Amino acid sequence: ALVFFAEDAAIIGLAV
Amino acid sequence: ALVFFAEDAAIIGLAV
Amino acid sequence: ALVFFAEDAAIIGLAV
Amino acid sequence: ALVFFAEDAAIIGLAV
Amino acid sequence: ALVFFAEDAAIIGLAV
Amino acid sequence: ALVFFAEDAAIIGLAV
Amino acid sequence: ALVFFAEDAAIIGLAV
Amino acid sequence: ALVFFAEDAAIIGLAV
Amino acid sequence: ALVFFAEDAAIIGLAV
Amino acid sequence: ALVFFAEDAAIIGLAV
Amino acid sequence: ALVFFAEDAAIIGLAV
Amino acid sequence: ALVFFAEDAAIIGLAV
């Protein structure tokens, strides 16, 4: 799976 | 809001 | 073009 | 995280 | 199918 | 323009 | 609604 | 940044 | 395949 | 046009 | 919910 | 990388 990143604090993974 | 990242140079935020 | 990032290991570019 | 909405019944969250 | 919402006035469905 | 919605609290517009 | 464009020939609308 | 196009009238930019 | 357009200068194709 | 697939039962087309 | 498909091996569901 | 599918004929991969 791919893991995108986004700041939400911390930078979290968004895994697909 | 979430902040995505992209290189455009520098790595800019893309906020949603 | 923009370059997004994703972990796949290593963090790869995804260029648009 | 953001929560989008969609009807599926009920209107469910889609969290990112 | 899922139905997203968007204001366009009225709030319309966007069905997928 | 279209206005999507997301909970972030409050439900904010995301306009396109 | 918004109308995006894409070549498919001709350039067609994609309406949302 | 990239600029997408959409008819909304006129054809507007959507910049990212 | 579909070809989207974006200004980047020139208007480039983005083919899918 | 492209036709994506999704299970919804049956696997339906999503045409663009 | 919808289930998209992607090869990752095996073809996995991506449910929304 | 992930490989999505779309009919375009044949069903082609779309790799990310």
K1–D contact, CB cutoff 8 A = yes
Helices and strands in chain A: count of H runs, count of E runs:
0, 2
C16–H contact, CB cutoff 8 A = yes
Q: Residue F12's closest CA among A7, E7, H7?
A: E7
Query: Could you tell me which residues come within 8 angstroms of residue G1 by beta carbon, excluding any fewer than 6 positions away?
Result: E8, E12, F2, G15, G16
Number of Cα atoms under 13 Å in the Cβ half of residue G16 = 18
* Residues recorded for chain K: 16
Long-range contacts (CB closer than 8 Å, 24 or more residues apart) made by K7-11: K7/L2, K7/L3, K7/L5, K7/L13, K8/A1, K8/L2, K8/L3
List the determination method: X-ray
Cβ-contact G15, G3 below 8 angstroms:
yes
Cβ-contact C16, H16 below 8 angstroms:
no
Query: Could you tell me which residues come within 8 angstroms of residue I9 by beta carbon, excluding any fewer than 6 positions away?
Result: none
Give the chains touching A; criterion: ≥3 Cβ pairs < 8 Å. Answer: B, C, D, K, L
Burial classification of residue H6, based on how many CB atoms lie within 10 Å of its CB (0-12 exposed, 13-18 middle, 19 or more buried) = buried
* Contact list, D4 vs chain F (CB under 8 Å): 4-6
**Closest Cα in chain A, distance from residue C4 (Å):** 8
- According to DSSP, the residues that pair with H15 across neighbouring strands are H3
CA H10 vs. chain centroid, Å, equals 9
DSSP letter at F12?
Answer: E
Assigned token pair, K14: 């991506």
Assigned token pair, I7: 């200004």
Cβ-contact B4, A6 below 8 angstroms:
yes
Question: Under DSSP, is residue K15 helix (H, G, I), strand (E, B) or coil?
Answer: strand
* Residues recorded for chain G: 16
**Placement of tokens 């290593």 in the chain:** C10
Rounded to an integer, what distance in angstroms lies between the CA atom of residue I3 and that of residue G7?
A: 5
CA B15 vs. chain centroid, Å, equals 7
Rounded to an integer, what distance in angstroms lies between the CA atom of residue G13 and that of residue G3?
A: 6
* Contact list, B12 vs chain H (CB under 8 Å): 1
Cβ-contact K12, E12 below 8 angstroms:
no
I15–L contact, CB cutoff 8 A = no
